[model samples]
Every structure is written in C-alpha cells, then in structure tokens.
Target chain A: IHHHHHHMKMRSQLLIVLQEHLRNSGLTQFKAAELLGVTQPRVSDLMRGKIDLFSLESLIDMITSIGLKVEINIKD
Target chain B: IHHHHHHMKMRSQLLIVLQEHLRNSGLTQFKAAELLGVTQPRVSDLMRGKIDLFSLESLIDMITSIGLKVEINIKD
Candidate 1:
C-alpha cells in the first residue's frame, strides 16, 4: 500500500477469512493442503500469516472452493 | 477454486473496485503508482487483471490506503 507495508495490511484480511473458513470446515492442514492444491507446508504458511506467499486470486479460489461467495458494490 | 479460477473471480471483483476507485480518483497510473507505493508497471498489471500477481491483502491495503474500507460478513 502507500502502511509501512500498508500493502501487507490488506492481504491479512483475506488471510484471516480463509484461515477461519478452513478451520470452520474442520479440515486439518494436510487436508487443507489437498483441498487447496498446495502442500501442507503451504497451508501452514497461510495459517501462519505469511502474507507474502499467496495471491488474492488464489485466496478467492480457496474461499469459493469452500462454497463461499464474494460480491462487491459501489456507493451512493 | 473448485471453479477453475473462482479465486480469480473474487479477486477480480476487488480489482474492479480498486481500479474503478483509482479511475474515479482521476489519477493516472503514475500517480496511482506513487500513491500506492508500487511501480507504474505494477499498477498497469493490476489494472489489466493480472490476478496471479497480487495478494488479496495487498489489494485491500491499496483500497484502504486510498481511504476505502473493507467489511466482511458471514451468515445463514
């Protein structure tokens, strides 16, 4: 971003959402690795808040893969 | 995602939001780059839907740094 890593600040939001959704799904990191098409270590990185590792598109895919929807709107 | 690039879909929505906001801000790619603390090429890539290149958090950071907010909800 324009944070001291204000760039990192936003990615953390998606990271939280995904980590929670995965936890709520009752899946282990191993299972999450399989589900997310990454290795177990990758899933660990996600959970650990290694915000440098994943792309927004990838996170969105992870969320939707779990049957969640993302929508956006502009204001008045 | 389970949908090929379902992740890309959600991220794209956010992209449109930020890109739209940038456009509405009447700022150029150079200005946006300066404001967002990324390069002009990065901003161009962002606007061009290079979904593979950016993290969701980063986009969120850009949005918020530019003074927009992100809110999430989960429900029945």
Candidate 2:
C-alpha cells in the first residue's frame, strides 16, 4: 500500500480529482489549459500537485470547465 | 433523496467536514475558535458554509488545529 500524509495531504482532495480527470482525458498541458482557462504554466503547476498554487474554488472551476461534476462526502 | 447543486456544491467539501466536526464536538463558536486558532466570527463563517470567505488552505488549517483528519476520493 502507498502512504499519504493524512495531515499534509488534507489540503488537496479536490486537486486529486482534477488531476485524475486531466490524466484520463489524455490532453496535453496546453490543450487542458485552453479548456481550463489557465496558462500552460498553471496547468503544469497543477499537474505537479503543487498544492500551494491552487485553491478549492480554482479546482472546482477547472472541474466545471471540463463538464465534470464534483461530489464531496464526509464521515468519521 | 435530497438534491444538491453539484456545480455550486463543487466548493466547500472540506467545509462540510469541518462543520460536522464542530457540531459533533458540541463546542460553542468561541470554544471552537480557541481550538481552531481563529476568531469566533471566523468560526461562525465556517459554520454557515460561506464558501467565499474561506480558502482550501484555511479550512485545512482549521481541521489540523482541532486534531481531525481529512481524506478525499474521486470517481466517474
């Protein structure tokens, strides 16, 4: 099994979703950026999982831009 | 089943977790704020789910301050 810093990892849940979507789309960074309304450098930043560079709202915008929906759940 | 604006709801997933944590803790806004290292008003904002007021990083900070963990998953 792989380990994730449950603490440090707390900040990027939506980012994971966005990244997975981007990867599955098989689109180049430039193409993804065009759809996501960001520059290629920004796309590269997201692809790298640079958490500090993204906000929850920003990720949501990207998800919506690509005709995807976001679902969030909480539990103990 | 209930309905939620999946698009508008894209944001605030972590906020939901934090709000639930506060409610289950049975702490007053002031008390939760003390534990969360934020002002009482800020705690109130979180309770209200005022997504515009809180950043992803801010919510993660609050979650960490109160000794809780966050996990995220994505799917089609």
Candidate 3:
C-alpha cells in the first residue's frame, strides 16, 4: 500500500517550526497575517496546527515572509 | 504589494535539484514515476521544469520518496 506518512510528517514539522516562531516573536495574529500575506484566520489556522489547511508553499511562504530561508538537502 | 517570488524561487530550486538527480541517475521516466509514486506524465512535467504544475508538497513528496531529506532553516 502506498502511504503518505513521510509527507504528513514533513507538513507537521513545518507547522511546528512556524508555530514556534509566531509564538516566540511577540507578533499579534493580525500583524503576523499581514506579514505573511495571508488572512488573520489563516494565520490562526497555522498557529493552531491545522496542517490540512496549509499547502507546503503556504507554510514556506510564511517562513520566507519573515526573512527565513528554507534549505533542501537530498539524502541517500 | 505582496509578492511570491521567494516561494516561486524555492519551487524552481527544488525542481532543479530533483531534475538534475533524475537526469544524472539514468532512471527512465516510467521507472522514476514508480519510484516516486507519481504518474509518468508527472515525472515528465518535473523533468521539463513545469514548476507551476507542481505543489510544494508534491515536489517534497518525490524527494522523500527517493530518501532525500528536506531541511528548513530560519534565517534572521
């Protein structure tokens, strides 16, 4: 059976990274939304770890919006 | 105006990484699809750099399918 556990894990890990940042940065939800180019509700969903509500690009969007860089490493 | 150049760049960078791998690894398109759990057409699109056709998760999915690990770095 083809399963997507790895993809799901990646999404969850990404969410944790973003959520931790927002929590520690002292940015209000609305402010975070503005900075992230998303709506307040969308930020709320991200903060709440609603992983399904976020595409990987959307998560990465928020990360880069705050000047963070995402690196991809190919492992064997 | 909020732009998504960063996200778009990320996608393109990821595509390049994957495409270079497939091209240098000598894997046929159909075999690559089976390895990546995607369709042959999808692999062709990836090989052709059709970035807009791929979601970030989809690209990461293919990467992980072949044992690649993606890392997220928060730059200040």
Candidate 4:
C-alpha cells in the first residue's frame, strides 16, 4: 500500500485497540468522555475514529493520562 | 545536537514507553496484534520500530487507541 494508505490503516487499527482497552477496562462512555475532556458524543466519534479534531500526539497523551503504561521499542 | 537526533531520541522514548505499557497491561504480541489489526510480524516490527511505514502521527494514534489519555503542553 501507499504511505498514506498505510497511515490510514494504522490510524484505524489504533482506534480499535483503544476502544477495546476501554471496554475491557470497564470504563463507561461518560467516564471516558470526562477523561478525554470531551463530550459523550465526541468520545463516541473518537471511538469511531472520527479524529479530525485531535492530533495524534494529543490522543497518546490522553491515554497516558489515564494511568496506562506506554512502552515503545526502537530498532536500528 | 541535531534535529534528526532529537526526533530519533523522541521516537525511541515513545517506543520505550509503549512497550512498557504493553508489558504492564499483560498484552501479548498476538493480543496486541489482534487489537492493532495487524499481523504478529507487523506488530513485532512496530514494537521494534521497524516502522518506516508509519508516520509520527500514526504512532501517536496507536498509543491513543490503547485506552490512554494524551495531553499536549505547547510552549511559545
């Protein structure tokens, strides 16, 4: 796939993972919305990957803020 | 220090954080891959930062997907 295509796919995958985490963690939509400092509808949109309003970095920070650990391994 | 070095360092830092979170969350490669909608090999590649396929934004999005909060503190 082209680079942008790859990016879009990656973004979608990220959203899926995030939603699963939330559901598995037993966080309600209202709670998630409060944590994200957004409205319930906005959180719903985010779960659906309607992410035009937020930057990618902002999203990661939001996740970090919720007390989840973020570990990354670098190659080369 | 060079800008590229800074970017690379930041990338490495992010990756480290992400890996830690995964381990702490008890998420296996297969599980993470499933959540990420990627093959295990691809997830491994991503964990290892063999990620020429993704942008910085993509990485941020992935972290966000895992039920964390992201906050951006911008300075003038």
Using DockQ as the measure, the top candidate is 3
Residue-wise C-alpha lDDT for candidate 2, range A6-70, written one tens digit per residue: 34453476777789889989899999999888999999988998777665546666876877665
Per-residue lDDT of model 4, residues B4-75, tens digit only: 222454466656666677777778999998876667886786777664545456556566667554433322
RMSD of candidates 1 onward, in order? 5.4, 6.9, 4.4, 13.5
Worst 10 contiguous positions by lDDT, candidate 3 chain B: B1-10
- When candidate 3 is compared with the true two-chain complex, its DockQ is 0.58
Residue clash pairs of candidate 2: none
> How would you class the docking of model 2?
acceptable
lDDT of 3 by residue, A16-50 (tens): 88898889888999988878878998888777776
DockQ value of candidate 2? 0.28
- lDDT of the candidates, in the order given: 0.70, 0.70, 0.76, 0.59
Ranking by TM-score: 3, 2, 1, 4
CAPRI-style docking class of model 3 based on DockQ: medium
Question: Candidate 4 lDDT, tens digit per residue, A1-76?
Answer: 1223323543454555566677776778999888767789867877776645545444555565565443443332
Per-residue lDDT over A1-76 for candidate 1, one digit per residue giving the tens place of the 0 to 100 score = 2113333444566678888888888888898888878888878878887777776556666766677776544332
Task: Please say which candidate is ahead in TM-score: 1 or 4.
Answer: 1
What is the per-residue lDDT of model 1 for residues B6-64, given as tens digits with 9 covering 90 to 100? 34655676778888888878899999999998899989988887777766666776877
| Ten contiguous residues minimizing lDDT sum, candidate 2 chain B | B1-10
Each candidate's interface RMSD, rounded to one decimal? 4.1, 3.1, 1.9, 11.5
